[PDB]
Design a protein around this ligand. Sequence first.
Ligand code: FMN
Ligand code: N8E
Ligand code: N8E
Ligand code: A26
Ligand code: ORO
Length: 371
Amino acid sequence: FESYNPEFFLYDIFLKFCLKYIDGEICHDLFLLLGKYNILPYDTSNDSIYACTNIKHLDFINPFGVAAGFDKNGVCIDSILKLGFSFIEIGTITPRGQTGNAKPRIFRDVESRSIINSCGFNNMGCDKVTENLILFRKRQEEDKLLSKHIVGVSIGKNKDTVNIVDDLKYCINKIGRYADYIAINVSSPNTPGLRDNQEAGKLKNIILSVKEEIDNLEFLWFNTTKKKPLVFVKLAPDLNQEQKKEIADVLLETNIDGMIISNTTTQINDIKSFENKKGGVSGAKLKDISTKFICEMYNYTNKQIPIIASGGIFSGLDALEKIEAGASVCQLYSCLVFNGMKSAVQIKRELNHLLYQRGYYNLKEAIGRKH
Ligand SMILES: Cc1cc2nc3c(=O)[nH]c(=O)nc-3n(C[C@H](O)[C@H](O)[C@H](O)COP(=O)(O)O)c2cc1C
Ligand SMILES: CCCCCCCCOCCOCCOCCOCCOCCO
Ligand SMILES: CCCCCCCCOCCOCCOCCOCCOCCO
Ligand SMILES: C/C(O)=C(\C#N)C(=O)Nc1ccc(C(F)(F)F)cc1
Ligand SMILES: O=C(O)c1cc(=O)[nH]c(=O)[nH]1
């Protein structure tokens, strides 16, 4: 075993320990601290050119990135990317820093590889996170192994903010220049009233405001693409067909660059250890629900809006199911929690194998093949 490799057995011993004894958020923060101090293992393999993917000019070296919320403040972007991910969606930052809901607010259920959280948009604020992203961009600029890595920024509203657009615009003005794309978060179930912004009418206004604000912002782009950040919207899977269809029409009207399918769900209640817990559920129990959601939106949007998959992706098989359902790229969170540091290297290898086995010459060919 190569001790610098994410697959080094020692990291699995650590993973077992963490999962067995350590509080969810404490472990998470410890992990981010390890990454901040750059003492995490890293992937040294070269990514298959056959598994590269894209969403317009956004070129991902591999189809795996880490979902929003994992590095809410962008404290160790480099370290996380070097685990083998092609991109990371930092934050889900708010104009002002806020503490989030009362702890403990993150619980694991290993048997079902599920997580439930009621974090509440805890983050250091757009100002501080921008500084962290700026530091990364400068670092990315001197390093070359990160030149093609992508960083997206998830944005939301502060707990008391009346008009979400006011917060979105503030964040864009501050960090938009350093983002490869912006993720409009209107699907968190831990911020009262936030999900109402998924109503076709409101969502349309929000998306246009975000796009205009990005244009109004426009060496210029200190990001990877060297172009203005694309716009994605992250949706909750707890919507009825009518709602999804109306949203689908808005996404086409607003010509949104992409849609991150499925944030956590609130319709799961078959998990024993989560009965007395609040928040959104992530993990295996969310996979089918979110995959189906992808199928629907892919159809409802006539395969015109690129999809970033999120929800219960742990293996290459799970990723292929998301891909064949219409997803062009995948985001992981729970996988990192349950499979640990070897998450990226492992899932990439699995997907390459599976793509080969099934007879695909590349990953793109598989996108939507479940038609
Ligand atoms: C502790 C925790 C915090 C999260 N924070 C955010 C966030 O700030 N913004 C966001 O868009 N999603 C957030 N998510 C949702 C994940 O990005 C992802 O959509 C969801 O967990 C489904 O992926 P998974 O099944 O692979 O875990 C969070 C999830 C967890 C478990
Ligand atoms: C200090 C050494 C402790 C060793 C414990 C050995 C347990 C044997 O499991 C072997 C396979 O582990 C592979 C890595 O898995 C990491 C994630 O483990 C999930 C929980 O596993 C529970 C059983 O250990
Ligand atoms: C099912 C019961 C499992 C019990 C497991 C006991 C595990 C104790 O874990 C200690 C080993 O983890 C090593 C730490 O690696 C993570 C960070 O690496 C940074 C470098 O650290 C070197 C000093 O450890
Ligand atoms: C609930 C929870 O456990 C988390 C969250 N969020 C989390 O990041 N955990 C977590 C993060 C990293 C590891 C490892 F180091 F092993 F790779 C293990 C667990
Ligand atoms: O910060 C949070 O509570 C949060 C945000 C989000 O988008 N999803 C989630 O499950 N939690």
